[PDB]
C-alpha cells in the first residue's frame, strides 16, 4: 500500500520562506520520481515542477523558475519543497504525488494529504457576533428563519453552534470571503411560527485559534 | 504555449443517466489525457488515463474516447457516489496546464427559495458599525442572483455573495449576501430592500422594511 | 533492456463480473501478448496469444486487447474456475523478460478475525529455546498486519509471518507469528502482547497475558 | 496428445552439478524447438532459454551465459539442462516445454511438471515439535483455538494430523519460511469451549524423510 | 515454400454453441482464405472465401474473421447439419498447399465402453491362420487405446486398430482390435488379454480367459 504524509500547515509572514516535507511509504523511491502541484484559488490546479533522484535533475514552471526549490533526501525516503518571497496570493493547496517509472508521464495514482499553507499579515483577533431577530411586529411568512452575522476573525475557521446542539436539522454553515484582510461568514436556521418567540434560541461561536467563546441572546 | 479548457462550465446529471463531458486542447497531443475525481476536502485520484485505460478502483461505467484535438468521457450510468468535478490532463509538453474544472449536480424537481430581510441590532448601532443581509435558502437551479436598491439606487461595490456547496439531505443550496454601509449612510436612508430573481417566478420577490414603522 | 510490469498487485473479483487487467511494457513491441494460468502446485498453459486468438480449452469468456505499448484482458464473466494468477508475455526480443504477476480473489461479506496468544510451555524452558506465538484466522480482506510490544517496545527483526493461500471451503485466509527469543530476555520481561490491526475495526484488538497471572 | 515427463527433485551440494533431463512424447521432436523458464520465489517467473536441435543452435539469458549448458537427444526424443555453480539463491522451479515450428515465438501451449532442484548445506534433522495450551485459567471467548508449533525440521515438508483425523474440519495448514538454514511451520484449529477440557486433544506430526514420529499431549 | 496447418487436431461442439476455429500461415497473404464442408463420401463445396464473403447456400451462422497471419472462423451457432470437416486456402502463390482438417463432434455424457475378448474357433486352426480380436463399442470421448500383453509381454508391431466415424442414432464411436499370431505362438502361449483405458475409468478394465478353462 502506498501512503505519502504530509506536514501540518504554517503561517508563514510575507516574504520569508516556508519548509515543506512529505515523507513517503510502500514503494522504492529513487527508481521513481516526484511532482508537485498547487490548486490556486478558487478552483483551479497548476503543475509546480517535478524532481528525479537519480542525479538530480528537475524542471520547473516558467513563472515559478525564480521560486520554487526542490531537494530530495533519500535516507529518510522523503522529498522536500521550498517556496521564497511570498505574496498575499500565494496561499493555496500543495500536493505530494510519486510519477512514474524513470518518466513524467503516465498520469500519478496517488496524491497528498493536501497541506495548505497561510501567508498573511494580519494577526489573530477575536469574532465579533451580534444577534439578529424579528422585526417590524410581524413575522412572514408560516416559516421563519433566524441567523447570526459573525465578522472580524481570524484565522479560518470558527466554530458555530445553535441551541447548544439541540437542533442539528435545519443548521446550514456558510463559507466566508476575503475583504479587508478579514473574514465575514453567517449561519442560517428555520423554525416553525407556532413556537416563536416562545421558545428561547442563541447563536454560540467559539474560535479555536484564540480560545475566545461569546454567547448571546438573540 | 500549451493551453486548454473544458466545456461547459457545471453540468447537472441524476443518478443513472449518461454524462458527456468534454475538454479541447489547443495543439494535438494525439496520447495522453487523464480525469481526476476530487471531492470537497479530499485529494483526487486518478481515473482514466490515455483516453482508454481506466486505473484501479474505478468501475466500468467510466469510459473515455476522442482522438487528435477531440476528447471526451462517457458515463454511463451515474451513481450517487460519483459526486464532485473533473478535470483533464496534458503531457505533450512542459509545464503542464491542467483543466478549469466543472462541477456535477443532481436533478430534481424546482423549488421555490424562501427570502427574508432583517434590519441590524441595537448594539452595533453604538460599536461603529452597521450591517443589512438578505437570506436566500432552498433553491434550484443554481443560476440566481441578488441586487440591493437602497431608496431606488444600486450599491456597488461592497455587496458580498457567499454561496454552499451541494446539501446531503434534501439536495438544495444556499447563499447569504450582507451589504455594508457606514453610519452616515443610516442615518439619511430608511428603505433597505433586497430582490431574489430565479427561474420560477415571473417577477423578483421583494422584500422591505421601514425604520419608522 | 526489454522490461515490463503489471498493474495492479492483486485483485478480488467474484463469480459473474468483469475483470479488467493490464501489463504495460516500456517499449512497443505492436504484436505478440500471452496470458498463462497457473494454479497452486499446477504448471501454466497457454490461454490468449497475439493478444487476440485464444488457445484452444478456453471459453469465449477469456477475451484480449489493447494496441502499442498498452495491453488489456477482458473477461466476462468469471467463473469459479478461473481462480488463480496471470503473467504476460514478450516475444520483441531475447532475452524475454516475464510479467510480475497478480493474484485474484473473491468477493464477499467482511469477517472480523479472531486473535489469541499463548504462553509457552514448560518443555521448552529446558531445551534453550523460547516462542510466543499469536494466532488469526478467518479474516477478509488481504490487508492486515502484526507487532510485537513487549513492555512497550518493538521487537525488529526477528518477527516472522506466515500466510495461507484461498481455502475452498469458506473462502478466508490466515496466518502466524511466532516471536524468537533468548533465555535472558524471558526472565527480565512479563507483558507479552500482539496485536491485529484489521480495517473493520476502529482500535487494534490486543490480546495479553501475564506470567505471574 | 502431446506429454512432456520431467524427472524427480535432486539434492545438491553447493558448488557441484546438475542433471535435468525430461523426455518428449506425442510429437515430432526434431522439427520444433526446446524452452526452459525458471520461477524463483516467491512469486516470479524467466525465461532460461532455448535449443533448436537442427544445428544446434541456441540462445540464452545474459545472467545464465556462464551457468546454464543445454544438450539435446534425438534418438530418445528428450531434452537435457546443465546447471553448474549452484548457490543457495538458486533453488527454484524448472519448466519443459515445446516451441513453435522452427520460431521461438508463438506463445507455448504445453509445459512441465514442474521438477524443482533443492541445495543446500544442511543435512536433515529430526521436528521438534511443543504442546501449546491454555491458559491463565479462562478461555476466552466462547470459541478457542489451538495449535502446535512445529520447528527444527528438514527437508520441506512434513505432515501433521489432529486426534488421529478424527476432526478434519478446522485444521489449517500453515507454510514456513526460511531462516538460519532451518523450517519453521505451524497449524490452528478452532474447538468450543463447552468440550474444553473435557475431550482429550493431542498434536501428531511425520517427516517422511527421516521417519521421524512424535506424539505428545497438550 | 508456403506451408500452413490448422489447430487443434479435432474439435467437439454441440449444437447451439459457438465454434472457434482457427488456421495459421507462415507467411502472409493478406488477402485470401477459404472454407470447405467435407462430410463423409461427398465432395466439398465453397463456404466463406476471402475471410469474409459467404457464398451461396450458406446462412448467417458462418462468419469469417482475421487479419494478417492470423485467421478465424466463428460458428455462431451451431446446427446439426454442419457436421463435417473444415479446411484453409490459400492463394498467395502456386503451388497451392491445402490445410490439415479438422474433425467435428458433439458433446454429451461420458460413457463407459464396453469390452469382450473371444477366443478363435476351431475351423482356424486347420486353416495355418489364428487370430484374437478384442470389441469397443459405445465410448465417448474419441481418446482411447489398447494394447496386447501376453503372459505379459508386449505384442508390437502387428497390432491393428480400425475407426469408426460418427453414429447417427446414439451418437458415439465404434472400434476393432485384432491381433495376428501364428500357429508355433498360440501353442506355447496361455493367457490371452487385451485392456481399455478410458478416462471415466481409474483403473484398465480387463478382459481374460484361458485355454484349459
Known amino acids: 500500500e502506498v501512503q505519502l504524509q504530509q506536514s501540518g500547515p504554517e503561517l508563514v509572514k510575507p516574504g520569508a520562506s516556508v519548509k515543506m516535507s512529505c515523507?513517503?511509504?510502500?514503494?522504492?523511491?529513487?527508481?521513481?520520481?516526484?511532482?508537485?502541484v498547487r490548486q490556486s484559488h478558487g478552483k483551479s490546479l497548476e503543475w509546480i515542477g517535478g524532481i528525479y533522484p537519480k542525479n538530480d535533475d528537475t524542471k520547473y514552471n516558467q513563472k515559478f523558475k525564480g521560486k520554487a526549490t526542490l531537494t530530495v533526501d533519500k535516507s529518510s525516503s522523503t522529498a522536500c519543497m521550498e517556496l521564497r518571497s511570498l505574496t498575499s496570493e500565494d496561499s493555496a493547496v500543495?500536493?505530494?504525488?510519486?510519477?512514474?517509472?524513470?518518466?513524467?508521464?503516465?498520469?500519478?495514482?496517488?496524491?497528498?494529504?493536501g497541506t495548505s499553507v497561510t501567508v498573511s499579515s494580519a494577526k489573530t483577533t477575536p469574532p465579533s457576533v451580534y444577534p439578529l431577530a424579528p422585526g417590524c411586529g410581524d413575522t412572514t411568512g408560516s416559516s421563519v428563519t433566524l441567523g447570526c452575522l459573525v465578522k472580524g476573525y481570524f484565522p479560518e475557521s470558527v466554530t458555530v453552534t445553535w441551541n447548544s446542539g439541540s437542533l442539528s436539522s435545519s443548521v446550514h454553515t456558510f463559507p466566508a470571503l476575503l475583504q479587508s484582510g478579514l473574514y465575514t461568514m453567517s449561519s442560517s436556521v428555520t423554525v416553525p411560527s407556532s413556537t416563536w418567540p416562545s421558545q428561547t434560541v442563541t447563536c454560540s461561536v467559539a474560535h479555536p485559534a484564540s480560545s475566545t467563546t461569546v454567547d448571546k441572546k438573540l | 504555449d500549451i493551453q486548454m479548457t473544458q466545456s461547459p462550465a457545471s453540468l447537472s446529471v441524476s443518478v443513472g443517466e449518461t454524462v458527456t463531458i468534454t475538454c479541447?486542447?489547443?495543439?494535438?497531443?494525439?496520447?495522453?489525457?487523464?480525469?481526476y475525481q476530487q471531492k470537497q476536502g479530499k485529494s483526487p485520484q486518478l481515473?482514466?488515463?490515455?483516453?482508454?485505460?481506466?486505473?484501479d478502483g474505478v468501475p466500468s461505467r467510466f469510459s473515455g474516447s476522442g482522438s487528435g484535438t477531440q476528447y471526451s468521457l462517457k458515463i454511463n450510468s451515474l451513481q450517487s457516489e460519483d459526486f464532485g468535478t473533473?478535470?483533464?490532463?496534458?503531457?505533450?509538453?512542459?509545464?503542464?496546464?491542467?483543466?478549469?474544472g466543472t462541477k456535477l449536480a443532481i436533478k430534481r424537481a424546482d423549488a421555490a427559495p424562501t427570502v427574508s430581510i432583517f434590519p441590524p441590532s441595537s448594539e452595533q448601532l453604538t460599536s461603529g458599525g452597521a450591517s443589512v443581509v438578505c437570506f436566500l435558502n432552498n433553491f434550484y437551479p443554481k443560476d440566481i442572483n441578488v441586487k440591493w436598491k437602497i431608496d431606488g439606487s444600486e450599491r456597488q461595490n461592497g455587496v458580498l455573495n457567499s454561496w454552499t456547496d451541494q446539501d446531503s439531505k434534501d439536495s438544495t443550496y444556499s447563499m447569504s449576501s450582507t451589504l455594508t454601509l457606514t453610519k452616515d449612510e443610516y442615518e439619511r436612508h430608511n428603505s433597505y430592500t433586497c430582490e431574489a430573481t430565479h427561474k420560477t417566478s415571473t417577477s423578483p420577490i421583494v422584500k422591505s422594511f421601514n425604520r419608522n414603522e | 533492456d526489454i522490461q515490463m510490469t503489471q498493474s495492479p498487485a492483486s485483485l478480488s473479483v467474484s463469480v459473474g463480473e468483469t475483470v479488467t487487467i493490464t501489463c504495460r511494457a516500456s517499449?512497443?513491441?505492436?504484436?505478440?501478448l500471452a496470458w498463462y494460468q497457473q494454479k497452486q502446485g499446477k504448471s501454466p498453459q497457454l490461454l490468449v496469444y497475439?493478444?487476440?486468438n485464444l488457445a484452444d480449452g478456453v471459453p469465449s469468456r477469456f477475451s484480449g486487447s489493447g494496441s502499442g505499448t498498452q495491453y488489456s484482458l477482458k473477461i466476462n464473466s468469471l467463473q469459479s474456475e478461473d481462480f488463480g494468477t496471470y503473467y504476460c508475455?514478450?516475444?520483441?526480443?531475447?532475452?524475454?523478460?516475464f510479467g510480475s504477476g497478480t493474484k485474484l480473489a473473491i468477493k464477499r461479506a467482511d469477517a472480523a478475525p479472531t486473535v489469541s496468544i499463548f504462553p509457552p510451555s514448560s518443555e521448552q524452558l529446558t531445551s534453550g529455546g523460547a516462542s510466543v506465538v499469536c494466532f488469526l484466522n478467518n479474516f477478509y480482506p488481504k490487508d492486515i498486519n502484526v507487532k510485537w510490544k513487549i513492555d512497550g517496545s518493538e521487537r525488529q527483526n526477528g518477527v516472522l509471518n506466515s500466510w495461507t493461500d484461498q481455502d475452498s471451503k469458506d473462502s478466508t485466509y490466515s496466518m502466524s507469528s511466532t516471536l524468537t527469543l533468548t533465555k535472558d530476555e524471558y526472565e527480565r520481561h512479563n507483558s507479552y502482547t500482539c496485536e491485529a490491526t484489521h480495517k473493520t475495526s476502529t482500535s487494534p484488538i490486543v490480546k495479553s497475558f501475564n506470567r505471574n497471572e | 496428445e502431446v506429454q512432456l515427463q520431467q524427472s524427480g527433485p535432486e539434492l545438491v551440494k553447493p558448488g557441484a552439478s546438475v542433471k535435468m533431463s525430461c523426455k518428449t512424447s506425442?510429437?515430432?521432436?526434431?522439427?520444433?524447438?526446446m524452452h526452459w523458464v525458471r520461477q524463483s520465489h516467491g512469486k516470479s517467473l524467466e525465461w532460461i532459454g532455448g535449443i533448436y536441435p537442427k544445428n544446434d543452435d541456441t540462445k540464452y539469458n545474459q545472467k545464465f551465459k556462464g551457468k546454464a549448458t543445454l544438450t539435446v537427444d534425438k534418438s530418445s526424443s528428450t531434452a537435457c539442462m546443465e546447471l553448474r555453480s549452484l548457490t543457495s539463491e538458486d533453488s527454484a522451479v524448472y519448466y519443459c516445454?515445446?516451441?513453435?515450428?522452427?520460431?521461438?515465438?508463438?506463445?507455448?501451449?504445453?509445459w512441465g511438471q514442474g521438477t524443482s532442484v533443492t541445495v543446500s548445506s544442511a543435512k536433515t534433522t529430526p521436528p521438534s515439535v511443543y504442546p501449546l495450551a491454555p491458559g491463565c485459567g479462562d478461555t476466552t471467548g466462547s470459541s478457542v483455538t489451538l495449535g502446535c508449533l512445529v520447528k527444527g525440521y528438514f527437508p520441506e515438508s512434513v505432515t501433521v494430523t489432529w486426534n488421529s483425523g478424527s476432526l478434519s474440519s478446522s485444521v489449517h495448514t500453515f507454510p514456513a519460511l526460511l531462516q538460519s538454514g532451518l523450517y519453521t511451520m505451524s497449524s490452528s484449529v478452532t474447538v468450543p469451549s463447552s468440550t474444553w477440557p473435557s475431550q482429550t486433544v493431542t498434536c501428531s506430526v511425520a517427516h517422511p524423510a527421516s521417519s521421524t514420529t512424535v506424539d505428545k499431549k497438550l | 515454400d508456403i506451408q500452413m496447418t490448422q489447430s487443434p487436431a479435432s474439435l467437439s461442439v454441440s449444437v447451439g454453441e459457438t465454434v472457434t476455429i482457427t488456421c495459421?500461415?507462415?507467411?502472409?497473404?493478406?488477402?485470401?482464405?477459404?472454407?470447405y464442408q467435407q462430410k463423409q463420401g461427398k465432395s466439398p463445396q465453397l463456404?466463406?472465401?476471402?475471410?469474409?464473403?459467404?457464398?451461396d447456400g450458406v446462412p448467417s451462422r458462418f462468419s469469417g474473421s482475421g487479419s494478417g497471419t492470423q485467421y478465424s472462423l466463428k460458428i455462431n451457432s451451431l446446427q446439426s447439419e454442419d457436421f463435417g470437416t473444415?479446411?484453409?486456402?490459400?492463394?498467395?502463390?502456386?503451388?497451392?498447399?491445402?490445410?490439415?482438417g479438422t474433425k467435428l463432434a458433439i458433446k454429451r455424457a461420458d460413457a463407459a465402453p464396453t469390452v469382450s475378448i473371444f477366443p478363435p474357433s476351431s475351423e482356424q486352426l486347420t486353416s495355418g491362420g489364428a487370430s484374437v480380436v478384442c470389441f469397443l463399442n459405445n465410448f465417448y470421448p474419441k481418446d482411447i487405446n489398447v494394447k496386447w500383453k501376453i503372459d505379459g509381454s508386449e505384442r508390437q508391431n502387428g497390432v491393428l486398430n480400425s475407426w469408426t466415424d460418427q453414429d447417427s442414432k446414439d451418437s458415439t464411436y465404434s472400434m476393432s482390435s485384432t491381433l495376428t499370431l501364428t500357429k508355433d505362438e498360440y501353442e506355447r502361449h496361455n493367457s490371452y488379454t487385451c485392456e481399455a483405458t478410458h478416462k471415466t475409468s481409474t483403473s484398465p478394465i480387463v478382459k481374460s480367459f484361458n485355454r484349459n478353462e
Open positions: 508475455q514478450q516475444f520483441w526480443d531475447t532475452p524475454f523478460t
Open positions: 516445454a515445446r516451441g513453435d515450428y522452427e520460431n521461438y515465438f508463438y506463445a507455448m501451449d504445453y
Open positions: 497475439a493478444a487476440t
Open positions: 506425442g510429437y515430432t521432436f526434431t522439427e520444433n524447438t
Open positions: 517499449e512497443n513491441i505492436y504484436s505478440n
